[PDB]
């Protein structure tokens, strides 16, 4: 998770937009960061048609087993890597695929 | 589903 190139740790929403702005507002450009409003969770910040969108990722526990979800448990992931890898191939609730990592 | 985020907007 921390090892992953697309993970930026504790950065703000404005900062994510500045970073995505640096790298040209390319469609499907993305990063994952910690949420400022929800420090227990994460945000997938994604550029689509030159607008940056922010998708909240929250932890939940089912029968003592942690999962992450962007849609109140309709789609569940063991960790951020699984979430990212799924959405590189499947749009799910997103408006586009995760195409390029914001470094 | 979350105020202030784009999840399943609108």
Residue numbers in the entry:
A (entry chain A): 426 to 528
B (entry chain L): 1 to 10
Reported in the publication:
Growth factor receptor-bound protein 7 (Grb7) is an adaptor protein involved in cell signaling where it interacts with a number of tyrosine kinases via its src-homology2 (SH2) domain78. In this way it plays a role in integrin dependant cell migration via its interaction with focal adhesion kinase and subsequent phosphorylation in focal contacts, consistent with its homology to the C. Elegans protein Mig-10 that is involved in cellular migration. It has been shown that overexpression of Grb7 enhances cell migration, while inhibition of Grb7 lowers the migratory potential of cells and is therefore linked with metastatic spread of cancer cells. While co-overexpression of Grb7 and ErbB2 occurs due to the proximity of their two genes on the 17q12-21 amplicon, Grb7 plays a role independent of ErbB2 in cancer progression. These important roles of Grb7 in numerous cancers have established Grb7 as a therapeutic target. Following the conventional nomenclature for SH2 domains, the Grb7-SH2 domain possesses a 3 stranded anti-parallel β-sheet consisting of the βB, βC and βD strands, flanked by 2 α-helices, αA and αB.
